[PDB]
């Protein structure tokens, strides 16, 4: 008979819907195609990024640690299930003891020798009241939790390598713009050096033009540092090196990522891997309270073995020398000092700390999906205002170019308009990077990318 | 007899007082009332913040994990001291053993059937040389360590909810100031648009106005994202949601928190939770070294049982047959080839490990008090300076408004004055936030967020 | 007869050499002297750092926790080694079994009595199959992992105290520069106050100069608290206080850190501490696989002791009551419930988990040293441009001073020049602190400071 108590899923401390406000959008209350049913291959529309996901799925090491830990706790489940069945094993035995004058059968102090080679089982208990079955349920549900933690490790891997490639892709263009700013500053210094060599400009404007080009060289070396360190932070996450068969990836000024419907706060509890990892931890916990409840009842321990036993070693086997042994045994405690009740209360509040950690996990998941929704609501006008800034500075630069080309104003104010346009382009790229980074983090927060394609 | 070592605390590696230089004002010497017994109701003078902390102490989840691990180690202590008392309980033994005729005293190979229920104890050990009571002392003192760890979890949770609420308030004030700057740039852009339509301002000034207003719209969208970010962080630190029954909270410029005395560096040794849990873990190691010392000495064991063992299938409770077994056992390990000596060495250097972790914890506590005392010593001479900057820019705007309403300068210079005044007020509130979060961290470092009221 | 499989270390997932491009430097061949054998007293060329880092290694406490954990696992190795040898001891006894009348040999209920002390071993198992030797190898190789985990802790402590001392010097230098800018701003303010009383300047330029002065006072205070905060970080990281007999340390203008040959990625597999730590964890699991495989085979347990037995305690010291006992009780399993194969492939995939840990640790080490190589190849051409900026601004200030002394521009343009020069010097101090912390992290990533001088 079993003794595991029943289970109801606890009411999460999440509210009814996602939070509303000036930052957020409007909720679509449908769950037709959720996020975890959308694979990463349809979500990411950059093919070299897709093969970087495909090579980081196979040549990583943290995902390998997780995918080996799931079969490690599968083996732990196999040994905790194997404790249920008996231990049929051949065990030899013998004795050569002297007995004194009072313990011997003869009366004179002499020795006696008895040897035994049998087959059977020692120190095994019959599971009649559900204890090792409860340990088996605890190990099974630890195995299920470890599988879901492997899924969580793959989601937090694919989000990290996606945002690492997005940071590297943005910083390539950052270096490309910083080289053009260095070119504009260098040509401004060349014009001020020509104006100093003839006599129009003094040395003060020459120094003030020189300090700007050394500032441009300093920040150029800074962005080369940051590009190289982000290449190293990417080649850590891939495990293997960057491949040489890269297809032509898309530009950063396009739609790299598709939109995902957020859904309801009750859509997390069925498909988010970390919170139902915590739910299977709670499953192991109430299997453990089912184990601790079975410590009160008696445990039928049966130690049976059948073989041969003889005094003489000259005869290995004989028809008479064959023997068996049965030995039934029951044991229930009567009056302890409370160690059974202390273990029962210990397992009960292990279940209680695991339900506390479960609802803490759903609170953290709801917090990260909530500020992911806030970023989805705000970047769609932040980046649009930044594009209007870019169009305004681009019209300013082309208007300054078409008033330079006639001949009204000199080339130095044209370089000033050009470096202002380049600063605006750098701000546009470092804001599009934050939009794509938080969208990848929202995709990880909803249900993550586990499967390859949709279902 | 018990043989745990006679204990004295290690001396605290600190200075005799807090450091004094240009940054630190002056230490206060002996505190009359210490920093620990100032509850969070007579310390946080904001009533809305007091209700927020009152929700966070009853709805957040890490506090529940710690405040149920305290009963987990209650149950661990109870089972560890219940191991000492005898485990009396009925058991029914038995042999159904075929026994060969050469082993038989009768002569023919026959069986023997002796089985019967019997009440008593199996392998009960007495700690008369003091190992089990030392393990009891170890379990009790690491239970007290987990008690102090629960107090540390509470006094970190109060500080975290306070810092989240203060960052949320400062971000709402920054949202209001940047919304005012966006309003002033729209009030500049429509004037520049009319000056472009009538023909005075060229299109370059119009593109500069578009540059300014789209930069301010991007900054407004960034801050209205970040308000929702830290609001969801406050939702996580509460556990529950924000209640709708709140009073009117205090502002930033008003006195939000009260004064707390620092004291000696010898108050952290008594009234700080992590130092006390390191101390009680050192206590538990000082009991484990006593267990390893008592492992040398003899450990006697008494096992006895009373019942019936009549040799019949149908005869169990028959008058005139009562089993009365009473077997003691002594033991003394003479030669162990360096196992028990290695166990005593291991327990002694575990005690040394806990001494090292105790002094590491007290130095981390000393440093996180000392940097907060440095911030309280010199942030006044920054806040007064930034307040004088805000006052100087305010009277600068008042003189620019006098020049405008007289009629000397146009409206755009008044908008530049409002730009400078809004930048000054934004710098003032982002410094007041740093002050308040640093002295909240100072109050957490002195260890006073535990109790509800004062003493 | 041991069953541990013979090992060869896994091939490195790193590439053939360090990566090269435009940011990286062109690497040399192999190392004449390796990076871990570079003189630790010869690497840091400051007097003060070299005298303070001995106090750092002698009085910091995570290093002491590691250097006591190495003795802890030495004692655990001695326990696991002494478990192989027998454990002989006085196995005392004594039985008083009031047996019923049907089981006693006389036919009447009587008292059965045995007594006596007995010297010898009990339940000791012969380790001729490689089980306890494999557990001894597991303990020995975890000891050898922790012995260089202590070296890794010493490495990161040396790197952390070097970065803390360098950021202390950099914050004191930029504190001095901020104090000089506060002096120049105060001179600008009282010149504008002198030019305000007689009526040359209105009450707008005076307010602008006043806002500049209070901005300087706020900046001076927020650098004073930063100096007092990282000095407290350094006095945490030393453990003891800063000593008073400090020799004069040479500043950031001269050289501080010698050149270190990086070498090859094959050189990193023999001298970096945590790589060999993961290799010894791998070998510990590769001994645990032999420990799991050695349970298929028949274990050879033995029980042997020799004592004197009698009916009463008066017949203990009796010539003719001596006896012995000799029980070779072997055992061998023939039917398990898959537990043996589960333990076998469980230890096999634990070996594969530690393989994945090892070739993840090499990837993290290669990422750290590749970041160091990028910084070493780029900070030279960053700071050459930055010192050209400082030289250009300095001779700009010299031209402005030789413009001022003849009396054609004000003192306020001289203060503009001093503003430019001091901002240039402050940016130079920050970039050189970046170079020094990146090169200290390179020295931590290659081989660390463990050898006290050049080996």
Residue numbers in the entry:
A (entry chain C), B (entry chain B), C (entry chain A): 1 to 455
Article sentences:
MexAB–OprM, the only constitutively expressed pump in P. aeruginosa, is thought to contribute significantly to drug resistance in this species. Here, we report a structure of the wild-type multidrug efflux pump MexAB–OprM from P. aeruginosa at near-atomic resolution, in the presence or absence of drug. The overall structure of MexAB–OprM is a vertically elongated rod shape, ~320 Å along the long axis and ~110 Å along the short axis, and the stoichiometry of OprM, MexA, and MexB is 1:2:1. MexB does not directly contact OprM; instead, MexA joins MexB and OprM by forming a funnel-like hexamer.
During this analysis, we identified two modes of binding of OprM to MexA; accordingly, we determined the structures of both states of MexAB–OprM pumps at resolutions of 3.64 Å (state A) and 3.76 Å (state B). State A and state B are quite similar (Cα RMSD: 0.47); however, the relative positions of OprM in each state are related by a 60° rotation. Hereafter, we denote state A as the 0° state and state B as the 60° state. In the 60° state, on the other hand, H3–H4 of OprM face the α-hairpin tips of the SC protomers, and H7–H8 face the α-hairpin tips of the LC protomers. The contact surface areas between the MexA hexamer and OprM trimer are 2992 Å2 (0° state) and 2983 Å2 (60° state). Several hydrogen bonds are present between main chains: Q104 in MexA binds to A203 or Y411 in OprM, and K108 in MexA binds to G199 or G407 in OprM. Also, L100 in MexA engages in hydrophobic interactions with V198 and V200 on H3–H4 or V408 on H7–H8. Moreover, the side chain of R403 in OprM extends inward from H7 and seems to form a hydrogen bond with the main chain of A105 in MexA. These results suggest that the two modes of binding between MexA and OprM do not differ significantly. When OprM states were separated in single-particle analysis, the ratio of particles in the 0° versus 60° states was 45:55 (in the absence of drug) and 58:42 (in the presence of novobiocin), suggested an overall ratio of nearly 1:1. The presence of two binding modes in OprM is likely to increase the chances of contact between MexA and OprM.
